[PDB]
Amino acid sequence: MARINYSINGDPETTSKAMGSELHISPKKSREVCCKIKGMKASEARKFLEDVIAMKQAVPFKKHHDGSGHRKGPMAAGKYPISASKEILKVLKNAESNAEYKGLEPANMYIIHAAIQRGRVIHGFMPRARGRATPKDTETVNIEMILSEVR
């Protein structure tokens, strides 16, 4: 419902920021994608996300390893997230545009931080058998990225 502070405060001299506010996506899948893309470059990250949305590339699922089998190539369980990939792509676009407005060079920048902070919950309901109604809720996510000109 409001703004958010960042868990890391890089110097504004060589730094770009961006936040995705209250995205309606799964926090676990977004956590896995954010883990995968941290430390890479901007162009490499965008190419990898393009290949993920195209179903040509699998992200490794290490913490939330359930509901998945092992994928081709050299890895254990992994999936093909789509919605989380598109949300992260939008946030990356915004961060690169902000950095180029700062007068910096996007092509030689790194994702030095990408986290998720799940936000408020809208409380829905679903009717069960024998007269009970258990909740079903709309989880939200906050995505944060920081780009830096140092490795």
The binding site for RNA (CB under 7 A) comprises 1-8, 12, 17-21, 26-29, 31, 34-35, 62-68, 93-94, 97-98, 101-102, 113, 115-121, 139, 142
The nearest distance, CB 27 to RNA, in angstroms, is: 6
The nearest distance, CB 94 to RNA, in angstroms, is: 5
Q: Which is nearer to RNA, 63 or 130 (CB)?
A: 63
Q: Which two three-digit tokens encode residue 127? A: 């009717």
Tokens 């919605």 sit on residue: 83
Q: Which is nearer to RNA, 26 or 148 (CB)?
A: 26
Q: Which is nearer to RNA, 48 or 64 (CB)?
A: 64
Amino acid (1-letter code) at residue 77: A
The nearest distance, CB 119 to RNA, in angstroms, is: 5
Return the ∠ at Cα 84 (arms to 29 and 103), rounded to 5°. 125
> Residues, the chain, total?
151
Closest-CA residue to 116 (of 17, 14, 11, 26): 26
The nearest distance, CB 109 to RNA, in angstroms, is: 14
Return the ∠ at Cα 45 (arms to 40 and 50), rounded to 5°. 160
